[PDB]
Design a protein around this ligand. Sequence first.
Ligand code: MG
Length: 343
Amino acid sequence: QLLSLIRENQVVVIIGETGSGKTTQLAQYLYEEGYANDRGKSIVVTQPRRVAAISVAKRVAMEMQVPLGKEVGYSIRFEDVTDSECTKLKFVTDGILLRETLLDDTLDKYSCVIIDEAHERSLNTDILLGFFKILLARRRDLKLIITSATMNAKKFSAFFGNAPQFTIPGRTFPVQTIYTSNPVQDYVEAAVSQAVKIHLANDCSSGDILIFMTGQEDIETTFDTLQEKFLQVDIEILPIYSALPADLQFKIFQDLHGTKRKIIIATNIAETSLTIKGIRYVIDCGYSKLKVYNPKIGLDSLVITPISKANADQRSGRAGRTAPGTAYRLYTEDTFKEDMYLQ
RNA sequence: GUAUGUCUAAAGUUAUGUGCUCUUAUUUACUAACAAAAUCAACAUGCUAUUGAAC
Ligand SMILES: [Mg+2]
């Protein structure tokens, strides 16, 4: 059905769920369907992250059983791994593709483009949405695929001429959601309070916790606070933030014992840049440190602001990866309904 | 300078048609005509500034 829908439409929007495995599969499906060869020239897939493009290129090259660069390859800033100019499947950053549109606007070395993780709505992504909407007039033969999340698939479709959505199920577990019955006074203090409750109202085995927080200084004060509560009354408590040195970032992926509980206290890095196994519990504070440019003053502001409904759901879907789970939201339903914007 | 005013008790009918017992003001406290032109006695012996999420 996928490889037929792309035959009968030049543009497709795809809701791929977490357990669809979309990113590795569809690229192979379309190459095997034939476009990627000298018939059409290469496939490109954009990513927003450098490390994503390389990791999925390694995975798909190994699923295709080829040395990376030779038929599956990648091209990112500082690093082009394509052993032939005619490398048939090419994973890239959206910025690299955008750079190439300047030197060849028709992109004639490519038959198909996949915009992966386009729900992240990067500057390069958003630009390429307009650029492709115009360029596909200038090339009927250029096939275009846009990945989407459920908040925006209709919106993406309508922009792209109301062209068809396709929704794939994924192998994802249910997460129970719990709003707080009131606004919290200080979310840091509720976060440690609920962390001890989930940790010790259950016995300490077989279910790890992720806690979302707004920044390093806030986060570092939290570990200190939570260790003491155990010593008053086993638990392993770990940080993650982008400024954290990579050796200490890496150890969070390594295992924990039976009877002991892992708990992870995190920035928005754990929404999307990093993926953790065995988390069954989430605590969401409902705020984030969003950069907004004020053009009148010419001034960036890093504001602790309410998150979006989409972002809340993304935090909620961190539990439910490995097994059924729970998300506790430090805010009300009505604040999610009105005070949080949708996208 | 603790306003002041009015009322009534009248007369019956004026002849016709003792216990108990609190109290360190625990008071429903009351009056304003009186006076108001308040400043010597001030003030310590030497002046400060601080931390961002993520790609
Ligand atoms: Mg007088």
